[PDB]
Structures are given as structure tokens and as C-alpha cells.
Amino acid sequence: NSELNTKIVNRGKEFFGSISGEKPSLFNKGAWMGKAMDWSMQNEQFKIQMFRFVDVFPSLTTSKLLTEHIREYFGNEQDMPAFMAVLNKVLTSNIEEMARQFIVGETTKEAVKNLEKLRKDGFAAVVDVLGEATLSEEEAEVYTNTYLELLEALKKEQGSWKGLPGKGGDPGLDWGHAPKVNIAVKPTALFCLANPQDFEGSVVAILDRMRRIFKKVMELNGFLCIDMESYRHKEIILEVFRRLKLEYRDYPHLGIVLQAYLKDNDKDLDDLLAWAKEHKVQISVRLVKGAYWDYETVKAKQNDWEVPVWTIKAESDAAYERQARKILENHQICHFACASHNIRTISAVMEMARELNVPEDRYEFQVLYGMAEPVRKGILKVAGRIRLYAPYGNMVPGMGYLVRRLLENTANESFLRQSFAEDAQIERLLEDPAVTVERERAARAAKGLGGLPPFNNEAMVDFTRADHRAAFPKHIAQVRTQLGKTYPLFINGKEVRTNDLIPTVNPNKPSEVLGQICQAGTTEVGDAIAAAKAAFPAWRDTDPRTRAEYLLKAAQAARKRLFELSAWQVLEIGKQWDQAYADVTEAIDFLEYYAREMIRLGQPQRVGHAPGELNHYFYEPKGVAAVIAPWNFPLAISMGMASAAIVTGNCVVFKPSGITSIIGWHLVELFREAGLPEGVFNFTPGRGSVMGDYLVDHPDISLIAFTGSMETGLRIIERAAKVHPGQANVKKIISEMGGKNAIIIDDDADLDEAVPHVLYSAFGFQGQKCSACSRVIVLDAVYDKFIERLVSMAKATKVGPSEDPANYMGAVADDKAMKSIKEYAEIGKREGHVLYESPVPAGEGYFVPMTIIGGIKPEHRIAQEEIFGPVLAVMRAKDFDQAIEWANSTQFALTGGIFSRSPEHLAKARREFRVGNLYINRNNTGALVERQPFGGARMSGVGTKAGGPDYLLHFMDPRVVTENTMRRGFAPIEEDDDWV
Amino acid sequence: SMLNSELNTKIVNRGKEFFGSISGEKPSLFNKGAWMGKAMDWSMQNEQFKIQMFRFVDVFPSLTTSKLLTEHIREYFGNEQDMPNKVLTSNIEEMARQFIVGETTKEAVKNLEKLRKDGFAAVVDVLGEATLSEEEAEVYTNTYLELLEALKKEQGSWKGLPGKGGDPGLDWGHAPKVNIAVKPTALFCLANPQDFEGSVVAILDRMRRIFKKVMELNGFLCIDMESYRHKEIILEVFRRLKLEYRDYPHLGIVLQAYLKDNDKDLDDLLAWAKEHKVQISVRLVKGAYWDYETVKAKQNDWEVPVWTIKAESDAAYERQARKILENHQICHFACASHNIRTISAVMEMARELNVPEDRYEFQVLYGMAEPVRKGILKVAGRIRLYAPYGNMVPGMGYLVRRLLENTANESFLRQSFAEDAQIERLLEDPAVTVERERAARAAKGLGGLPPFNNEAMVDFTRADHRAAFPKHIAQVRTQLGKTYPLFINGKEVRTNDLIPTVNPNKPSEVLGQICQAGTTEVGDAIAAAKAAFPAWRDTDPRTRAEYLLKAAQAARKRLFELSAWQVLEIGKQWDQAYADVTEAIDFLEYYAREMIRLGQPQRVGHAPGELNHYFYEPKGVAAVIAPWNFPLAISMGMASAAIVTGNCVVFKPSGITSIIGWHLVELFREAGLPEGVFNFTPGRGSVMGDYLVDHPDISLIAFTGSMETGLRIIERAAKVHPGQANVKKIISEMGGKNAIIIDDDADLDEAVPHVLYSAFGFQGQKCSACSRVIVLDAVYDKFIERLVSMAKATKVGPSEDPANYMGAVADDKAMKSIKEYAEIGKREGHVLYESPVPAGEGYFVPMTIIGGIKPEHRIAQEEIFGPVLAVMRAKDFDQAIEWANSTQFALTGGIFSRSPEHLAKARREFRVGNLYINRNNTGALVERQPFGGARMSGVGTKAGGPDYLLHFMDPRVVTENTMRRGFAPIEEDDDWV
Ligand SMILES: Cc1cc2nc3c(=O)[nH]c(=O)nc-3n(C[C@H](O)[C@H](O)[C@H](O)COP(=O)(O)OP(=O)(O)OC[C@H]3O[C@@H](n4cnc5c(N)ncnc54)[C@H](O)[C@@H]3O)c2cc1C
């Protein structure tokens, strides 16, 4: 709209004029922070070092930690920038000063005092309470009580404050209309287990605390704003706002933050306004662009989710202006807080409101305390109604907040950087962002092999979606209509029934029988081996691209059944919703990845370059593969091992674990739907005590793929090494065995991240993973604090049936597992000291308490033996060297983790913490195909890594054909010949 | 320069007149009105068709049944509609007849007399398949004698061709009427510069017999020149024969202008003739083996002996022709070329130098370049046709070579008569063409290292290489009698248990005494290796690779010395010994590069906020248990692979090759390898064998040797003992029972010597050796007769004497075991050949060939590891493949066949680790032939290939969440926005 746009541009021009060249302190090159940010902006390596240093800074609580980190992040004094122990003191004082710039105080009393100073300078405030991530109920209560404490202090003071001057209205209110007390609350800080996987439980827990705060706010006629956090919780937070509003439909001073950088926001704003109209209530919206842009883009890309944010910056600006116009048009029902430091954005809001003649009591402006100083002052001068978002509290979360402000101010796309560091042209700065979008989209308008798209991991289940949340109960219900079947063997394309049946039951409810499984004797296993051996010649002679096509069809068949296949796993083996879905996506990943790997490896390659000669190097299968699969990843690992053997040209005799035989039957369904030729895949569940050695010992077996315990793996290795009469090959072992995996918690670890990652690593799926954290090795000086937070978080979780998404973990695999694990828990309780032992439900189910035991040392049994259940050992290391020594003190070497923000300690861990899969600053479980090829050596395996580029070669043997191409003195000349 | 321009003008003007007098007349091969011209036309337009057609003509004479013929036609040319029996046969046969003067002596003689009446002289050549036996050499020799007897009776009635003066009974008044050419290698089936003196004498003795008959007729004998391999031998034959008959003027030699050596060879021969005051004759040619020499040199890292720009050969010809003409007083000249420029250049140079006509003549091959031949007759008058005669079988091979000559891209005939090239380009001074082509031609390794190339094989065309072996064998003999200690943690450790090591061809010759490690010493070595491991593991992969490169240079500098040790200690022939050392060098160079390639962590996945790096780590202590049959090569390959990947090695050489094992100590010491990284512990298997394999500090075992021992090791290594860190990794190369299939259509000239070498090279003591030859029913009798006849020509004796084909086997135990197997085989089949062996000491087993062998027989199944070859008669090709696949082994295999269908079937179904087509099945080279198989022949590990180093390591992944406080560094390969 050209005329309006011209007014906006002129308003912006007047604004830049009234600023008089003033730079915000962060861009003041005369100040230390300005020099620091200037160099960060010119030098990306320095920015990364400086910003990461500020992040770790509040953990550097001794002189040694501090001195060492300074050297590790910035190098020696001679190699540092000019603007930078005396060095300890100067750096410390400058960083602390930077953080204080952005906070109104450290105590409630100080905050209140400083808020009054702000009022005398003409500024209103919205107060926020700084806090570390809420990891427990006790922490949520502290946060809640801090708001209550703040409100009580403000209640006593506000009567003595003259209201900020306005043009009309009520002289006891700010600008004649706004409540003097205004606070903002982060909803997820009110509940440590906030998760849309438990949508209702999360809404209620947050709502119950928000209600308590809100009641006190109303008691002093104040305003409560509910802030918006990451996209993961956006729908939860919207629902919290809607419920609290309907509980107090007549109270006007309740706001919600909406983020214009979200593609969803056009619909969300429209829905909320329509909702307010329908319910005949009023609302208030603080429109922001959004604070988590890099996080959302990374998180979505890590999970093959649609990126929920716009990714061209002008799109967020254009969305803001569009959505602000929508709000202002609806001022009758919607009060507006314009929260932005962008002069174009601010100018657009001002002129749109003027054009729509919106009453001034329906819109105000907000900025963050301590930044964009000239912008703040310009708003005061032109609009008069300006509120500062003012955090207060402890310096530890204050440093985290500081880093976020530094990121915001120094971003390449930041309006503040462009205006105040980069000398950007005013006309460009104030351009209609809609025009910017068109130009940027047009600019941006200007790989796989063999016609196949490149490999990408299958999208994870996404419980931000109502449809994904609804799918599970529906599919679990459908599965229940299918219970009670008898599952036969499947051999040479035919169903073969035996009369030895073993029931398979729900571990969370053993009275619920899912079905009966036929058991193969040695006769039937021998039959299956015979069928596989007979199908082998034609299958080996099938083109690798064709073999790969069967895997691609199986992947599509599985993809079309994703929630159904997932539901079976929830009931048969007690997978939580996310765990079950991830099992199926991983199976799909193996199929898509191994299909592409065979296509890659399937072409004979010329080796050497001598003329008159062609050497071609290529691979052939081995023969019949025995595949012996675990129950803990019943589709993923089964499908991975079987499909690798199949795509490489082998034929498979497959023994699923008894308690997940139905999931094993899914392989039959999937390969049959793909049209796999008869005998290439044979399904023979059976009693190991009857046919286990028989399968491994058989002369017609050429390879054995096994995943499971070390004891069984080692027995297989010993027996397989013998060559019996009639045996064609030396048997090839592909084996993934157990682990006793440690995560190290260094002194400088970010405990907000370390704690929930350790909890998930230890207790996700009841701890039943070869990759699970069973030892947490914690540095002396952070031990007490770490353990308090871990135990408190554990106490908040619930143990119960996996079909109920409210439960964190549930029953273990079967009766034998429960008894074994419980015995290990008793052993550990006599070795160390019990720190936590959860309640479990009464009645039936193979429940083992979520168990945490401290005081564990390397010489203890539960520091050495794989328990495969929810029993976590906590070990206290005297220094980092001992932490590493202890991590390396078992016979296993599968996975490991380290939380540390020390370059030197991370380097030492990369080199010396010699596990097959080492994870830095995140959980040590959940390895993905291609990204984390999985497996190790020592007693954890034989160095084969599933889901990686070396895996398929283990299922084959290389061959070379060498041809003398010269006849009667001449040879064809080939493209890669070394010629003349 | 000014003179150069002037003479070039006369040459160009002579060429222009030569062409003007031809005017549209084409050689019959370029006659597109004929079937021959049509087939060649399409060959020149379509290289794929050329390859099919020329290969078909090559295989054509083996197509002896209606089945063979019909199937080959389809396999080479496709269905009878995708193309461009009795008929196609007549066309190819007519094509071959164009180039030969007859099929019998009498027909040849009649046709030669006809040619005389048409004014053409001749030089007569006898066609033949390759000489593979003494009997064949005698047949070839007697055919010349027969020819000469026939000509002797006729020549008296021949009027000499007209000339300008002289003797009316001689051609042109001066040339002998009878002139024959002989191929020297056809006189000796084992001609080979590795036995230089033996080859010269055997050839000379037959050539002298022919020459005496030639002299009786007062005729001319030309000694033809063959491939570069035999050039020096042939020169020496000519020189000796000339001096035996210093006064007889009618003896010629061919010299090849396409050889870089020829400038010097011609200078040398001319100076030699002067010194000895004799006269000579030279037929100067460009050369017939160009493609072969180029390929052969490139295959062996030898300097290519031929010029590789065609104009360079032309330029060399004109340069060398001038030199001969300058020397006309002592050197008679035959200009042998179909090239009008070349011929015109010679005519003008003869005029410039005023050379008498009786000192030069012109020669062309019968049946080609007809207008060129006609032109020479008209202008010069002295033209002689090279006139081969004989059997259609070698006639077809000759046909192929002529078709190649005529249709080559750079052929002067093709450009003149097919391409309608501009006459100015055709008659250009080739020296100018050279400069232009060089200028145009004037207009990758990694980490700064050159790319890998296999080390050059020993080259016995060189006098220095021939002389080096006797020199170095003698030098090694001055160093015998030493006591060899263990080498543990950088220190020499003696023990009281000594085992002598002796020469298998002369067991009374003791090379030294070897200390034996007890379990105590082996445990000490393992402890040393274990202590050295953490620092070695942490050494940069590039640095570890540098040690291997230093060791490779150390070995390269000692090549002949290291070779000589093997000749004496284990009975390697000179070439076998040198090849063992070059293979060792190759492993070092190749594994160094492989570790450099594999040594850098690679990002995997592309998700942002995350870095996954995938990389490799060594395992720990490796036991390396090495064979005696490739005592440096395989030992060094296994040890250096383990070492470069970051492991430390405890190495047990075979007892009988312990000194070669010591060479590893010497080489790693010279490279400066850190102490403990390589330890040398020879010892008695019965004392410390199981100890070494069972030890809990061993993480890897690299073994090469017998199936029986390999299988025992695999079984024992599977157990995890108390304190054992890893499941032990096996890298194992075991035996074979390798077959070569001889198909009905096999080229027996190649199949026979390749099979003989595959079976008996190094006494058959190779895991890759051919111990079964499976021969198709219809070619059985023919193949076996030639194979046995070639075998009979070879001698068994000490490997230090290069005259011997093979020698003693490794030791007394091997001899006893192999002889028992021979007796078993003789009761199972029937002996076709059993060689004499020397009297007296030495572990000699006869070169033994046994027929009537079937898959149920023990010697069709069990690896003998000695000079015992089973011959098996297959009823059809399907059974041949079935039989090839009938053992428990699958290491190597070979097939001789010119059937695309059968070759395709073999590629698919003959499932050995290394299958060879139309060559021997031994001698695998690093990178070109990564070596190893499965079944009972190994565990699918392939030494010398790109999958090998990974077996000595385990992969690791480090995954880092790079996001802190909502931000992460953006990395280049991130999936982003
Ligand atoms: C008082 C106040 C309260 C706030 N409360 C919250 C809250 O509860 N929740 C929340 O999420 N944020 C909140 N914010 C917003 C956030 O903290 C930033 O301050 C704000 O987004 C910066 O925008 P801008 O108009 O100041 O600056 P600009 O430089 O104009 O805009 C920058 C913004 O654009 C977006 N952006 C950057 N790059 C791209 C890109 N490549 N593609 C698309 N978009 C891009 C980001 O949102 C970034 O923050 C609040 C802001 C204020 C002032």
C-alpha cells in the first residue's frame, strides 16, 4: 500500500534523525563490550570462542578452572586481541559488567528499587525472573514462589508510584490505562517434564502453577504475560493461555506471546482472535518475531521435520507487519504490545495504528532492558508508551541470557547490527519488507545416484501435531482387535506349523496374551537352511540393483504402516510411543540406506591402469546367513541385519527373540509384500536350547549376524570357528554385543543439559539398550549439585504402562529380566548407596523401580556387569584423569558420553575415551543410520558398524577378474589406460 | 638447413611424381568393390567392429566344427540382422591367401618362379605357429632345408632379372637368386635373455645348419628381427655366425627404426663390422610389434623401447637409411617400406651420396601396396617381395597382422588410399611432423607423494641386469656362516637353540644358524610390543606411513642383493627372486598411501548442529606368522600392513627362510622404526606356536600358509582368555587347488607356455599355482602333446643357474610329501611326463605331468605344493566349469578361450578370488590384482587391495552436539537454508 508505506518510511527517517548518530552500548567501540562485539562480528572463529566462553563462564568457580579455560578459549596472552592472575580479574570484571547491563537486579528488593528508577525516567516495565532450566518440581516451586515474592513486594510499593503520564484516562494507571505491575512467566519453567507427548499432563501441570501466579497478579490488579518458548511447546502454551483465560473471562490483563517468525502464526493469530470472538472475551498479544530461530532450524533439520520458521529474515519482518495490522484492526478484542527493536517495524506499527485510528490504550511498545538504547529513547520521545522487559535474579542464568542478547545483537541479519555496526543505507533499512521478500525469494530461486534421491533419515514422530498424538491410541486399539493369533514358521514361501507353542504377552500387563508362536526344532531349522541354500544360486545371480529394489519396496510397505507397526511394539515389548516409532523409522532407514549401499558397491570397478589388461574388483555373497536378533530393537536391528544379508545376495534363516516374535513376523509381511523370492528370507523362531547351537554349527551356514549379550556372542564366535565336514566357508561373524557405558560430567558441564540427557540415556526404554548409560562418572566439585538435580528430576517421572504416554518408562521385557535386574539392584545397594528408588504400580506387570545408586567404584560388580535395566551407577571421580581412567575400566567399549565445555578435556576424551561411539554434550543413545554408524570392539563387538559405509562388505567376499585383452599383438585402448 | 630445404624439395617432387603415376589405383584391401575392402572399410569407420572382426580372424582357424563356427559368428557379430559359414569361410581364406605365395613348398616354388617372370625378386619365409618344442624347431628348420633343396634344383634354369651390367646369371647382375628369411625364436622354444648364452647357442646351432645349406646354393640368408625381448640375442646370433663365415657376403640382419636403441645399435654394428673387417647387410624396417612393445613395457614399468609418435619412426628411418647409405662400402642396404615418402627419401639420398646400385634394393611384403610395388619396379627396377608360405593356421595369424598394418590410424597406406589425405602432408619431411607433434603433446598423487606404481620388474634385455645376479650371488656367498639372533625391543637376543638354514639345491651349503625363541622369549616380544603400542597408536598416520616409505627405499637400494639371498636360501629362480623383492617394495609403497588415505577422520551425515567423524584405530599386538614361499613379499606385506595401521608386531618367519625374515629386521632398522614396534621371533612351532596364537595380549593374527595350520589357528584364536581385550581378528590367506580351463578355441601358442609356467614356476610352490589343467575333449590330444613336448625341453636344476626352468623344492620334508603325492597320482591317473633330475644332493622332485585325472581323485583335490600337474579331460564346457568348481578351494583360476559366451560364463561361475583370462594364473601384482579368496582358501581378505588395511583396525565415531545456548557454527557440508 504505497501511500501508507511512504508514511512509514518517513516516520522511520524521522526516527533515525532523532537518534543523532547515537550507538547502543554494544556497538560503542569506545567501550570494552563494543570492542569485543566488533571483533566477534569481523571474525567468526573469535565469535564462537567468545560466546562459548561467556556460556561456560558462570561454571568457572575456582582459579584453576578459570585460568585454564581462558587459555583454552583465547590462547596465550600474546595471541589475544588487544582489547583483552591480572587477566583473570580484568576478563571477569568485564564479562560480569556486560551481564549486569541486561538485568535490573540480583535480588527482589534490588529489582524493585531499580524498577522505580526506571519509572522516574519515564519507562514502564514487565518483570521476568531469571532461572536455570526447571528440572524438578522443587525447582518449579522455587520459580513460582519467586514470582509470588516479587508480586508481594510490588503490591506494597505500587500505591506510592504516580502513574506514567498519558493523554487521558485514569491518573492512577500508567499512561492513564495500563496496570503498573506487569510480569512475564516462562511456562516450561513451571513443569520439568513439559512434553507434547504427554499433552494434557503438560497443560495441566503448567496451568496449575500459572493459576497460582495469576491469582496473585489479579489480587493487585496487575498484568500477566505468558511468554512463548520453543515450537515443541507452542500448542501446549496456547492451550494453557486459553484455559486460564476462560477461568477468568472478565479479567482483561492477561497476555500471550505470539511469534511472527513461525509459518503457523498467520493461522494461530486468526484462530485465537476467532476463539476470543466466539467466547466473547478479550485478549492481549505481545507480538514478537522470535527468540529461537537457529534452534528451530537445526532441530527440524535433525529430524526431517518441516522447518517451522521462515528462513528468509524479511519473511519474518513481513509477517510481523501483516500480523500487527491484523491485531490493530481487531483492537476491540485484542490489546497489542509491539515488541521489537527494529525501527522499520516500530514505524510500521505507529503508522498503521494512526491510519486505523486505534485508541492509544490498545497498543504499547516494548523492548528488552539494557539494549537498543537509542531506539528505546526514540520510542519514549515519539510514542511515549514504552515498557522495558526487565529480567532479574542470579548471575548464573543471567550469563545464559547475556549470550542470547549478544547473539541477537551481532547476527548478520540483525536490524541493530546493520544499523549500528554496518552503516547500512537508510532506504534499504526502511524498505517495505514485502518488497525485500520478493527480491530475496527471486534471488534464492537462482544429490542422489541412479535416479534415486539421496539417503535421508525417516522423519521422527512429531507430537506437536494433533494427528500424531491421536494416531497412537487409535492404532493400539486396532492392534488389540488382532490379538490371539498363532504365528507359524515361514520357510521357502510357505507357512509351516509346529506343535510347540509359546505365548507372547504384554510386559506391562502379562495377563494380556498377544498370540502364540510356533517353535522350530532342528528339523525345521535344517529345512529352512536347505531352502535358503537352494534359493541362493538364483538370488546371488540377481542384479544388485534389482536386489536393492526389494528393500526399497519393503521400506515403502513399512512406511505405509508406520503407526500400526509402532503400536505392536508398544504392547508386545513395552516401548513408549516415541521409542516404538523410532524403532520402525530405524528399520526403514536400514532398508533405504543398505539399498543405496548395494547399488554403490554393486558395480565392478576397474583397478590398475596398465594397458592390454582389465582388472575388475567386485563383491559376491557368502551363502546362507543365520540372523539371530534381539528383543530390544525388535524391528530395527532385525530388519537391519536381515536386509543387509539379503541385499548383498545372501539368503537368511532368521531367529527373532521369543518375546518379540510377532515383530519378527512383520519381516515376513514386509518382505512378502515386496515380493521377495521364496527361500531368500526364512522365519524360524525356536528355543535356543533346542536349535541354537544347531543353527550356528550347521555346515551350510557361511555367516552369522548376531546382536545380543556378550556371553551368547562369545559362544557363537567360539563354535562358528570350527570347520565341519561339508562346510564350504570359514564362517563370518557380524556381532554387536553389550556395553557398560559411561557418561562423564566434567566440572564445567552445563547441568541444564547434562541432567535430562543422563536421565534419558539411563532410563529411556527402561535402560534396555546396549548403548544405555549405566555409569555416570561425575567430577568431585560438581557431584553434590549434579546428583541433587538428577535425583529431583527422576522423582518427577512416573513408572507405568508404555501405552500411557504420561509414563516416562514402564515394565522391563519379561519375568526373567525383572528378576535379574532386581537382583542386580540389591547387589548394587550393598556396594554403594541408594539415592533414588521410584514407586511402581501395584498389581501385575514386570516393573523394576527407576533406580539410582551412588558411591560406586570401578571395583564394584554394578560398575562392570551389564544389567540391561533401569539401574544407574553414579561414580565420583577425584579429577578428570581419573574420570577417563574409570570410563575405560570395563571390558566393554560400545558407547560413551561426556558433558564438558573444555577444549582440552574434550580433546583428551576424543583421543582416550576409546568407545565405538562417543557423544559430546548430548545423550549417548539413539544412534541414527549414516550419522552414527554403531558398534565397537573389546567385548562389545567385532568392529562391525551397522548403519555405516563399511557394513555391507562384511556380508560379502571380494573377487577380481583379470583379462589379458591382447590378441595377435593388439588390444582395445580403454579410457583409463596409461597410454602414450 | 638451406641444403635441407633443397633436398626435401627433390624428395617431395619425387613423391608427387610417384603419386601422379599411381592416379586412383588402390591396393586391393582398399577396394570397396570387394568383400575384403568392404570389411576393412567398416573396420576403419567403426572401432568396435574392427575389434570384433580382427579377433574373429585370429580365432577363425580353431573353429573346426559347424557348432564352433556358427556360435562364434553369432557371439562376435550378433544375430544375422544386427550385422552389416561356407561363405564367410571362403572370404576370410581368400583374404589370407592374398598375403602368401602358397601352402606347400612345391606350390611356393612354382609361384616364386612366376613372380620372377613378372620381374620380381623374392625373399622366402616359412609360416609357422610359435615354436614350443625341440621337435617343432626341427620341423621349422627342416622346412627351410627342404625349400633350399627345391630351389637348388631350379635356380640354374633361372635367368637373372635384368640390370644395367654385371653377371647375367645374377639378379640385376649382382644379387643371389635365392634369398630366405628366418625367424630366430622359431629355432628355440625357450629363447629368453634370462638364459642369454643358452638362447644364443641353441638358435645359432640351428641357424648355422640353415646357413650352410644357403651357402651351398650361393644364396642370401636374412636373419629377421622379432620382439625387443630377443633383440640382443638376435644381434649376437648374427655377429657370431658372420665371424664364423667372415668371407661370405650374403648374410643380412633386420634392424628396426621404431626402436629408440636403433641409432646406437646401427652405429655399434657398423663399427663392429669395421673392427672385424667384414661386410654386412641390413634390412631396415620400422617395426612389426609396436602395440605389443608399448603394452608390455607399461605392464612392467619398463621404459617403452619404441618411439610413440609415428613421425618419430619415419624420421628415424630416413636418418638411419642415410647412415647405412653413407656406409655403403661395408653395408649393403634393403629398404623395406611401403611408404612413398620413405621410399622417395631413400632414392634421393642414394643419388645425393652417389651410391652404386648393387649396394641397395627395395623390399615390400607380398600382397600389399600393389601400386607402390609397381612404382618401385618402374623407377628403381630392383624390387624384392617378402613371400611367406605355409599352413593356413599361421597364415591367419599373419593375415591379422597385415590387416592391422593396413588399417592403423597412422598407416601411410590408409591415409593415402582410404582417407584421401593431402599429398603435401603425406610427403612432408617427418622431422617437421615430429616437431609439430611434440609441441602439441607438450600443450595424480596425494599429499605430495607421487601416485602408486608397481616397481619395475628385472629386465634381462639389459647386460647390467644379466650380470648382476652372478655378482650378487657371489657377494652373498662371502656373508654366510652367521648366527641370527632374535630381535626384541630393539635388542639382539641370543638363545642356545640353533637350527641351520641350508641351500635346497645344495643342502651341504649352510647359509647360517638361527636362534629359536622359547615361550619365554615370545612372551618378552609380546610384552615389548604391548609396551610400544600406546605411543605407536598415537603416532600420526602420515608419520607411520613415512617409515614404510623409508623401508621401501632401503629395499629398493638392495634389490639384487635381497634377491640373491632368496636364490640360495629357498631356491628361487632369478626372476622369481627379484619379483619377490619388488612385491615387498610394492606393499610398502601401497600400504603407506592407503594409510594416508584412510588416516584422516571423515565427517559423516550432514545434519547441522552436529558433527560426526568416522575414523579408524589399531587393535594392539599382531602375531604375524609367515610362509617360506614368498619369504620377503608376504612377510613384509602382512607385517607392514599391521605396523602402518598402528599395531605392533611379533613376527615368526618360516624356519627355512629365517634369513629372509632377518631382512625385515634390517629394513625396519634402517627406516628407524621405534623399538618394540616390530619383533623377530623365529621358533619351533611345537614349542611356541600355540603359545603365540593363544596369548591374551594378541589382538590380531596375520597368517599365510597351509589350510590345515590356518584352520587350527582360526579355531584356537576364537577363544577369549582371561585378560584378553579383544575378540581376535584373523587375516588369513591359505592354499588353493587351482585350475586353468583350456577351451576348444584356445590359442595353444599362448595356453601351453602359460600353463607350463603356472604349474612349474618356482617348482609349483605357490598358493596360486596351477595344479589342475582342465582341457576340453576335442582339443585334449593336441594340447597335451604340445604341453608335454615343451616340458621335455626344460631342464630341472639349481636355481642359481638361469638355464634351469625349475629346481629343488623347499626342504627334505616337502620333497618327501610331494613324492608321496606323485606316487598317489600315478596310481590314480597315468604319467604323461616325468623329468630327469640332477644326480647327487638337492631336494629335487621331477617336473611331473599326470593325465586321466577326475574330480574324485586325491590329486584333483589336495594341495600338493610341488611340481605335479593333473590333467583332466572335460566332455564339454559345462563340465569344465563344474570340475573347476569341484574342490574345497577357490583361490585362483585361469581360462584360455576366445568365446565371448564362455568367457562370460566363466566370469560369473568360475568363482575364485582371482580369475585370469588368457594368461597364467600366478604373479598377482599389488593394486592390479589384489590377492585372496574364500571357501577353504582364506577369509576373504585381499592383500594388495583397497579393503586390506581396514582389517587391521576398528572403526570409531565421535558425535558432537555443537549447539550451545541456541547457536552452533555453520559447517560447509551442513544441510542448511
Ligand atoms: C519485550 C520483548 C519480549 C520478547 N519475548 C519473547 C518470547 O516470549 N518468545 C520469543 O520467541 N521471542 C521473544 N522476543 C523476541 C526476541 O527476543 C528478539 O528480541 C526479537 O525476535 C528480535 O527482533 P527485532 O524486531 O528486535 O530485530 P530484527 O533484527 O528486526 O529481527 C530479528 C529476528 O528475525 C528473525 N530472523 C533472524 N534470521 C531469520 C531468517 N534467516 N529467516 C527468518 N527469520 C529470521 C528472528 O526472530 C530474529 O530474532 C521478545 C522481544 C521483546 C523486545
Tab-separated table of C-alpha atoms and ligand atoms in Angstrom, chain A residues 186 227-228 257 259 261 286 288-293 310-313 316-317 339-342 345 366-368 389 405 408 413-416, ligand 1:
chain	number	residue	atom	x	y	z
A	186	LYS	CA	8.098	-18.835	31.014
A	227	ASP	CA	5.768	-15.905	27.167
A	228	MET	CA	6.285	-18.241	24.184
A	257	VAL	CA	3.273	-14.012	23.196
A	259	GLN	CA	5.934	-15.349	17.231
A	261	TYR	CA	8.745	-15.966	12.618
A	286	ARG	CA	2.719	-9.363	22.633
A	288	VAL	CA	7.428	-10.800	18.677
A	289	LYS	CA	9.449	-12.169	15.791
A	290	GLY	CA	11.005	-14.935	17.877
A	291	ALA	CA	13.949	-15.930	20.020
A	292	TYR	CA	14.816	-19.477	18.959
A	293	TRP	CA	15.467	-19.229	15.176
A	310	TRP	CA	10.529	-18.621	7.920
A	311	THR	CA	14.146	-18.831	6.731
A	312	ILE	CA	14.457	-15.562	4.871
A	313	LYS	CA	14.683	-12.825	7.506
A	316	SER	CA	9.579	-12.626	9.484
A	317	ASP	CA	9.505	-8.825	9.133
A	339	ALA	CA	7.874	-5.976	20.966
A	340	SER	CA	10.671	-5.077	18.540
A	341	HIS	CA	13.925	-3.075	18.319
A	342	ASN	CA	13.508	-2.636	14.557
A	345	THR	CA	8.793	-2.469	12.292
A	366	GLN	CA	8.244	-2.934	24.421
A	367	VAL	CA	11.974	-3.505	24.209
A	368	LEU	CA	14.475	-5.540	26.197
A	389	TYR	CA	11.334	-6.227	29.600
A	405	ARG	CA	21.447	-10.963	23.770
A	408	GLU	CA	20.665	-11.250	18.829
A	413	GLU	CA	20.580	-10.264	9.625
A	414	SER	CA	20.083	-8.168	12.790
A	415	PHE	CA	18.484	-4.782	12.184
A	416	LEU	CA	20.640	-3.466	15.043
C	1	LIG	C1	9.948	-7.223	25.220
C	1	LIG	C2	10.241	-8.422	24.353
C	1	LIG	C3	9.752	-9.669	24.739
C	1	LIG	C4	10.010	-10.794	23.926
C	1	LIG	N1	9.522	-12.043	24.303
C	1	LIG	C5	9.786	-13.162	23.505
C	1	LIG	C6	9.255	-14.517	23.818
C	1	LIG	O1	8.495	-14.695	24.943
C	1	LIG	N2	9.450	-15.565	22.942
C	1	LIG	C7	10.198	-15.385	21.798
C	1	LIG	O2	10.410	-16.405	20.941
C	1	LIG	N3	10.797	-14.124	21.496
C	1	LIG	C8	10.543	-13.038	22.296
C	1	LIG	N4	11.044	-11.787	21.927
C	1	LIG	C9	11.789	-11.633	20.656
C	1	LIG	C10	13.267	-11.967	20.657
C	1	LIG	O3	13.786	-11.986	21.927
C	1	LIG	C11	14.009	-10.896	19.846
C	1	LIG	O4	14.137	-9.787	20.668
C	1	LIG	C12	13.347	-10.450	18.546
C	1	LIG	O5	12.916	-11.510	17.763
C	1	LIG	C13	14.293	-9.537	17.744
C	1	LIG	O6	13.533	-8.931	16.721
C	1	LIG	P1	13.606	-7.412	16.207
C	1	LIG	O7	12.313	-6.813	15.528
C	1	LIG	O8	14.134	-6.722	17.525
C	1	LIG	O9	15.004	-7.389	15.361
C	1	LIG	P2	15.372	-7.778	13.950
C	1	LIG	O10	16.887	-7.698	13.645
C	1	LIG	O11	14.468	-6.972	13.160
C	1	LIG	O12	14.723	-9.115	13.766
C	1	LIG	C14	15.488	-10.282	14.047
C	1	LIG	C15	14.583	-11.504	14.173
C	1	LIG	O13	14.296	-12.014	12.901
C	1	LIG	C16	14.217	-13.408	12.974
C	1	LIG	N5	15.130	-13.965	11.999
C	1	LIG	C17	16.510	-13.904	12.008
C	1	LIG	N6	17.002	-14.539	10.933
C	1	LIG	C18	15.962	-15.028	10.171
C	1	LIG	C19	15.878	-15.745	8.984
C	1	LIG	N7	17.077	-16.115	8.276
C	1	LIG	N8	14.677	-16.085	8.494
C	1	LIG	C20	13.534	-15.742	9.136
C	1	LIG	N9	13.581	-15.041	10.303
C	1	LIG	C21	14.755	-14.672	10.833
C	1	LIG	C22	14.474	-13.794	14.385
C	1	LIG	O14	13.256	-13.968	15.005
C	1	LIG	C23	15.206	-12.629	14.936
C	1	LIG	O15	15.046	-12.566	16.316
C	1	LIG	C24	10.755	-10.647	22.747
C	1	LIG	C25	11.237	-9.403	22.379
C	1	LIG	C26	10.978	-8.290	23.182
C	1	LIG	C27	11.525	-6.967	22.728
